[PDB]
C-alpha cells in the first residue's frame, strides 16, 4: 500500500521545484525559520542572474542604452560578495535596479534563447524592491524560485488520500550508486518533466542535437525500458506559461522544421505532446498519462497531482 514516485527529465525542467511544491502542499509547507535561511540564497540567485545577463551582453556584443551605468557593472562584481553574511547594501540594490532597467540590458534579456539564462531570474529582478528591504522575510513563493545546487539524492515523503508517498529526485548524484539505483527499483510511477519553453533554444556548442530532442531521446530510453513495463508513465509538459508567451513570437519550426501546423499555443503544444507520446513503442500494452503543468503555480501542481493520485487509486481498485 506504499507508493514510490520517481521524478526524471533533463536539467532545469522543474523536478526540484515539484518536490518543493510537494512540501508546500502535503507537508506543513515552509516555516519562517527556514524562509529566513533562504534569504541569502535569494540574494545570491538574483546576483548570479544579473551577472549572467551581463556576461551575455559581453559575448553577444550589446551596448547599454546609457553607457553611464556601465560603471555599476564594474562595481557590481566587487559588491558581489556583499550578500554572503546577509543584507544587500542599498548601494547594491541601486546597482541592480539601474542595470536591470537599462533598455540595453533588457535587449539582452529578451534574447535569452541565445544563451543560458536562469528561469527564476525575472521573478527576482522584477520583485527587487520587495526583497531589498532589510526587514525582508521570503514568501513561500520566493522559496519556490530558489535554486539550490544538489548534493546527491533528493527525497520527500508525505501522507495523502490514505496513502504513503515516497518521492525521489535521483538527478546527477554520480555517487552512492546503490542508493542511487534503488531509486529506480519498484517504482509505481515515473514523472518525466519536459521544459516546453526550451523549444526555441539555439543549438549550443556542446550539443549533438536540439535540447528538446535531447529530452525526447531521454524519454525514448525511459519509456521503452523492459524494467518499466509495469510502471505508470506520467509526462509533465512543464513551463506552459513561458511556452505560451514564446510561441507568439518564436515559431515551432525552429525546433520541428517539418511542422506544418499553426502557431496557436494549443495546436503547438498538442504537436509536441504527440511527438513525445509517439515514442512509446509498446503503445497497446502501455498508456502515457500526459499533463501540462506550470510548476511554479502551486494551485496547478496541486490539481494535477490530485488527478495523478486519483488515477493511481483507480489502478488500485483494479487490483
Amino acid at each position: 500500500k506504499e507508493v514510490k514516485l520517481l521524478l526524471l527529465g533533463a536539467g532545469e525542467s522543474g523536478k526540484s521545484t515539484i518536490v518543493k511544491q510537494m512540501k508546500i502542499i502535503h507537508e506543513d509547507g515552509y516555516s519562517e525559520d527556514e524562509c529566513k535561511q533562504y534569504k541569502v540564497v535569494v540574494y545570491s540567485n538574483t546576483i548570479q542572474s544579473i551577472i549572467a545577463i551581463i556576461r551575455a551582453m559581453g559575448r553577444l556584443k550589446i551596448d547599454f542604452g546609457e553607457a553611464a551605468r556601465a560603471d555599476d557593472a564594474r562595481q557590481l562584481f566587487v559588491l558581489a560578495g556583499s550578500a554572503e553574511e546577509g543584507v544587500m547594501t542599498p548601494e547594491l540594490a541601486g546597482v541592480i535596479k539601474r542595470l536591470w532597467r537599462d533598455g540595453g540590458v533588457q535587449a539582452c534579456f529578451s534574447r535569452s534563447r541565445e544563451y543560458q539564462l536562469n528561469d527564476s531570474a525575472s521573478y527576482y529582478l522584477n520583485d527587487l524592491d520587495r526583497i531589498s528591504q532589510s526587514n525582508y522575510i521570503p514568501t513561500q513563493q520566493d522559496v519556490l524560485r530558489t535554486r539550490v545546487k544538489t548534493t546527491g539524492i533528493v527525497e520527500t515523503h508525505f501522507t495523502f488520500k490514505d496513502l504513503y508517498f515516497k518521492m525521489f529526485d535521483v538527478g546527477g548524484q554520480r555517487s552512492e550508486r546503490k542508493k542511487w539505483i534503488h531509486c529506480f527499483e519498484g517504482v509505481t510511477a515515473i514523472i518525466f518533466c519536459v521544459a516546453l519553453s526550451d523549444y526555441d533554444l539555439v543549438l549550443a556548442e556542446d550539443e549533438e542535437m536540439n535540447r528538446m530532442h535531447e529530452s525526447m531521446k531521454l524519454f525514448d530510453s525511459i519509456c521503452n525500458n523492459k524494467w518499466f513495463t509495469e510502471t505508470s508513465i506520467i509526462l509533465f509538459l512543464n513551463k506552459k506559461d513561458l511556452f505560451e508567451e514564446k510561441i507568439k513570437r518564436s515559431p515551432l519550426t525552429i525546433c520541428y522544421p517539418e511542422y506544418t501546423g499553426s502557431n496557436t499555443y494549443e495546436e503547438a503544444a498538442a504537436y509536441i505532446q504527440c511527438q513525445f507520446e509517439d515514442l512509446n513503442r509498446r503503445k497497446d500494452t502501455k498508456e502515457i498519462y500526459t499533463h501540462f503543468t506550470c510548476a511554479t503555480d502551486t494551485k496547478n501542481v496541486q490539481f494535477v497531482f490530485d488527478a495523478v493520485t486519483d488515477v493511481i487509486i483507480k489502478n488500485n481498485l483494479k487490483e
Binding site: 526524471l8 536539467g11 536562469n118 545546487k149 538527478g171 546527477g172 525500458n225
Partner: peptide, 21 residues
C-alpha cells in the same frame, strides 16, 4: 548506457546561477 544517459542529461542544470546551503 541508460543510466549513463540519465546522469549525463540530468546534470547540465546550470551550475552557475545556483547556490548551496
Amino acid at each position: 548506457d541508460f543510466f549513463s544517459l540519465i546522469l549525463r542529461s540530468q546534470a547540465k542544470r546550470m551550475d552557475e546561477q545556483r547556490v548551496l546551503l
